[PDB]
mmCIF file of C-alpha atoms and ligand atoms in Angstrom:
data_model
loop_
_atom_site.group_PDB
_atom_site.id
_atom_site.type_symbol
_atom_site.label_atom_id
_atom_site.label_comp_id
_atom_site.label_asym_id
_atom_site.label_seq_id
_atom_site.Cartn_x
_atom_site.Cartn_y
_atom_site.Cartn_z
ATOM 1 C CA UNK A 1 53.168 200.271 67.441
ATOM 2 C CA UNK A 2 52.057 196.823 66.403
ATOM 3 C CA UNK A 3 53.405 195.438 63.148
ATOM 4 C CA UNK A 4 51.351 192.268 63.330
ATOM 5 C CA UNK A 5 51.166 188.934 65.106
ATOM 6 C CA UNK A 6 53.545 185.999 64.853
ATOM 7 C CA UNK A 7 52.080 182.539 65.134
ATOM 8 C CA UNK A 8 54.600 180.117 66.508
ATOM 9 C CA UNK A 9 53.275 176.654 65.928
ATOM 10 C CA UNK A 10 55.022 174.355 68.384
ATOM 11 C CA UNK A 11 54.798 171.046 66.593
ATOM 12 C CA UNK A 12 56.700 168.530 68.687
ATOM 13 C CA UNK A 13 59.721 167.635 70.789
ATOM 14 C CA UNK A 14 62.138 164.902 69.669
ATOM 15 C CA UNK A 15 64.002 162.698 72.159
ATOM 16 C CA UNK A 16 63.622 165.123 75.050
ATOM 17 C CA UNK A 17 65.590 164.788 78.293
ATOM 18 C CA UNK A 18 64.220 162.444 80.976
ATOM 19 C CA UNK A 19 63.570 164.447 84.120
ATOM 20 C CA UNK A 20 61.447 161.990 86.068
ATOM 21 C CA UNK A 21 62.380 158.310 86.405
ATOM 22 C CA UNK A 22 61.875 157.075 82.876
ATOM 23 C CA UNK A 23 60.034 159.881 81.086
ATOM 24 C CA UNK A 24 59.118 163.554 81.360
ATOM 25 C CA UNK A 25 56.070 165.864 81.311
ATOM 26 C CA UNK A 26 57.297 168.577 78.930
ATOM 27 C CA UNK A 27 55.721 171.924 78.138
ATOM 28 C CA UNK A 28 57.313 174.769 76.222
ATOM 29 C CA UNK A 29 57.731 178.319 77.422
ATOM 30 C CA UNK A 30 58.264 181.070 74.884
ATOM 31 C CA UNK A 31 59.471 184.577 75.722
ATOM 32 C CA UNK A 32 59.848 187.677 73.535
ATOM 33 C CA UNK A 33 60.061 191.230 74.835
ATOM 34 C CA UNK A 34 57.878 191.200 77.957
ATOM 35 C CA UNK A 35 55.621 188.537 76.465
ATOM 36 C CA UNK A 36 55.589 185.059 77.982
ATOM 37 C CA UNK A 37 53.547 182.163 76.527
ATOM 38 C CA UNK A 38 53.410 178.415 77.243
ATOM 39 C CA UNK A 39 52.031 175.250 75.642
ATOM 40 C CA UNK A 40 50.077 172.687 77.588
ATOM 41 C CA UNK A 41 51.847 169.915 79.428
ATOM 42 C CA UNK A 42 52.020 166.551 77.682
ATOM 43 C CA UNK A 43 52.090 163.682 80.200
ATOM 44 C CA UNK A 44 54.902 161.118 80.192
ATOM 45 C CA UNK A 45 56.242 161.561 76.656
ATOM 46 C CA UNK A 46 59.755 162.514 75.508
ATOM 47 C CA UNK A 47 58.477 162.929 71.958
ATOM 48 C CA UNK A 48 55.443 165.113 72.734
ATOM 49 C CA UNK A 49 53.353 166.219 69.752
ATOM 50 C CA UNK A 50 52.013 169.574 70.941
ATOM 51 C CA UNK A 51 50.706 170.803 67.583
ATOM 52 C CA UNK A 52 49.907 174.020 69.403
ATOM 53 C CA UNK A 53 49.916 177.691 68.454
ATOM 54 C CA UNK A 54 51.377 180.508 70.474
ATOM 55 C CA UNK A 55 50.674 184.053 69.348
ATOM 56 C CA UNK A 56 53.006 186.968 69.974
ATOM 57 C CA UNK A 57 52.466 190.674 69.296
ATOM 58 C CA UNK A 58 55.374 192.043 67.252
ATOM 59 C CA UNK A 59 56.656 195.625 67.404
ATOM 60 C CA UNK A 60 60.198 194.921 66.299
ATOM 61 C CA UNK A 61 62.014 193.354 63.366
ATOM 62 C CA UNK A 62 65.212 193.098 65.451
ATOM 63 C CA UNK A 63 63.749 190.827 68.171
ATOM 64 C CA UNK A 64 64.820 187.329 69.269
ATOM 65 C CA UNK A 65 62.573 184.534 70.532
ATOM 66 C CA UNK A 66 63.617 182.399 73.507
ATOM 67 C CA UNK A 67 62.211 178.887 73.927
ATOM 68 C CA UNK A 68 62.629 176.847 77.102
ATOM 69 C CA UNK A 69 61.392 173.330 77.778
ATOM 70 C CA UNK A 70 60.491 172.244 81.301
ATOM 71 C CA UNK A 71 59.288 169.043 82.859
ATOM 72 C CA UNK A 72 56.123 169.630 84.897
ATOM 73 C CA UNK A 73 56.136 168.114 88.376
ATOM 74 C CA UNK A 74 52.703 168.664 89.865
ATOM 75 C CA UNK A 75 53.805 168.552 93.494
ATOM 76 C CA UNK A 76 57.322 169.886 93.167
ATOM 77 C CA UNK A 77 59.731 172.033 91.156
ATOM 78 C CA UNK A 78 59.837 171.781 87.359
ATOM 79 C CA UNK A 79 63.239 170.699 85.954
ATOM 80 C CA UNK A 80 64.887 172.401 82.954
ATOM 81 C CA UNK A 81 64.887 170.383 79.695
ATOM 82 C CA UNK A 82 66.962 172.730 77.538
ATOM 83 C CA UNK A 83 66.450 175.999 75.702
ATOM 84 C CA UNK A 84 67.041 177.590 72.324
ATOM 85 C CA UNK A 85 66.587 180.930 70.633
ATOM 86 C CA UNK A 86 65.959 182.104 67.062
ATOM 87 C CA UNK A 87 65.755 185.307 64.972
ATOM 88 C CA UNK A 88 62.495 186.444 63.363
ATOM 89 C CA UNK A 89 64.041 189.225 61.284
ATOM 90 C CA UNK A 90 64.765 186.982 58.303
ATOM 91 C CA UNK A 91 61.129 185.855 58.352
ATOM 92 C CA UNK A 92 59.935 189.454 58.767
ATOM 93 C CA UNK A 93 62.138 190.793 55.957
ATOM 94 C CA UNK A 94 60.759 188.086 53.709
ATOM 95 C CA UNK A 95 57.224 189.230 54.522
ATOM 96 C CA UNK A 96 58.009 192.745 53.314
ATOM 97 C CA UNK A 97 59.054 191.029 50.116
ATOM 98 C CA UNK A 98 57.278 191.400 46.791
ATOM 99 C CA UNK A 99 56.258 187.766 47.115
ATOM 100 C CA UNK A 100 52.684 187.541 45.827
ATOM 101 C CA UNK A 101 52.115 185.140 42.931
ATOM 102 C CA UNK A 102 55.148 182.865 43.271
ATOM 103 C CA UNK A 103 54.665 179.112 42.637
ATOM 104 C CA UNK A 104 53.666 177.204 45.790
ATOM 105 C CA UNK A 105 56.702 175.432 47.244
ATOM 106 C CA UNK A 106 58.905 178.401 46.347
ATOM 107 C CA UNK A 107 61.928 178.730 48.649
ATOM 108 C CA UNK A 108 62.573 182.345 49.472
ATOM 109 C CA UNK A 109 65.240 182.716 52.155
ATOM 110 C CA UNK A 110 67.281 180.037 53.864
ATOM 111 C CA UNK A 111 68.839 180.325 57.313
ATOM 112 C CA UNK A 112 71.913 178.179 57.944
ATOM 113 C CA UNK A 113 73.037 176.289 61.064
ATOM 114 C CA UNK A 114 75.868 178.244 62.689
ATOM 115 C CA UNK A 115 77.859 177.997 65.912
ATOM 116 C CA UNK A 116 75.845 181.015 67.015
ATOM 117 C CA UNK A 117 72.287 179.824 66.313
ATOM 118 C CA UNK A 118 70.212 176.863 67.467
ATOM 119 C CA UNK A 119 69.278 175.357 64.118
ATOM 120 C CA UNK A 120 69.842 171.614 63.810
ATOM 121 C CA UNK A 121 69.428 171.977 60.004
ATOM 122 C CA UNK A 122 68.972 174.831 57.534
ATOM 123 C CA UNK A 123 65.650 176.634 57.970
ATOM 124 C CA UNK A 124 63.638 177.152 54.783
ATOM 125 C CA UNK A 125 61.385 180.205 54.541
ATOM 126 C CA UNK A 126 58.796 178.899 52.088
ATOM 127 C CA UNK A 127 55.923 180.320 50.035
ATOM 128 C CA UNK A 128 53.188 177.660 50.138
ATOM 129 C CA UNK A 129 49.421 177.857 49.626
ATOM 130 C CA UNK A 130 49.456 181.655 49.450
ATOM 131 C CA UNK A 131 51.242 182.135 52.784
ATOM 132 C CA UNK A 132 54.858 182.793 53.784
ATOM 133 C CA UNK A 133 56.075 180.158 56.255
ATOM 134 C CA UNK A 134 59.271 179.349 58.188
ATOM 135 C CA UNK A 135 60.002 175.866 59.468
ATOM 136 C CA UNK A 136 62.567 175.366 62.205
ATOM 137 C CA UNK A 137 64.233 172.463 63.939
ATOM 138 C CA UNK A 138 65.845 173.826 67.077
ATOM 139 C CA UNK A 139 68.569 171.876 68.864
ATOM 140 C CA UNK A 140 68.081 172.403 72.579
ATOM 141 C CA UNK A 141 71.048 173.937 74.415
ATOM 142 C CA UNK A 142 72.075 173.100 78.006
ATOM 143 C CA UNK A 143 70.716 169.595 78.026
ATOM 144 C CA UNK A 144 71.949 166.105 77.141
ATOM 145 C CA UNK A 145 69.477 165.636 74.277
ATOM 146 C CA UNK A 146 66.344 167.014 72.663
ATOM 147 C CA UNK A 147 65.028 168.887 69.629
ATOM 148 C CA UNK A 148 61.947 171.032 69.075
ATOM 149 C CA UNK A 149 60.201 171.409 65.698
ATOM 150 C CA UNK A 150 58.409 174.714 65.146
ATOM 151 C CA UNK A 151 56.863 176.660 62.276
ATOM 152 C CA UNK A 152 56.329 180.397 61.972
ATOM 153 C CA UNK A 153 53.165 181.860 60.394
ATOM 154 C CA UNK A 154 52.088 185.506 60.118
ATOM 155 C CA UNK A 155 48.757 187.082 61.141
ATOM 156 C CA UNK A 156 47.799 190.541 59.866
ATOM 157 C CA UNK A 157 45.996 192.695 62.444
ATOM 158 C CA UNK A 158 43.697 195.376 60.967
HETATM 159 CA CA1 LIG B 201 60.780 165.923 87.323
HETATM 160 CA CA1 LIG B 202 57.257 165.336 85.711
#
């Protein structure tokens, strides 16, 4: 049933919540359907630069991705550091586009911050270097501070 694979590049966290004394040990957990993926832990850093790829199998245009940040405590429970979700459908519908041969830098669809989504700023779906890309800044919900910067890429699966 597979449509393809979505690469979620988790770039970094910005000003993440402090869940130890003075810092945190954040890792990101991403869920979609029954799939559950996580980045590595970055030690003692509220602006962790993960630059890390998570790969999800996609069977559905109508699916939502959930992202949760936790602070790893080796010898105890891990505290919540906020969560956000986002839609992939706009990305997916832009893939089915007749896109090929547009100038690099070309902005194709734009998703706007709403009371209902987690975007800290409008999300540009861009056609660069022969690939369709979506960049996101997600404002974490349920926490006193924190943002996560991610980028979507698509992998065809023959
Ligand atoms: Ca802790
Ligand atoms: Ca910790």
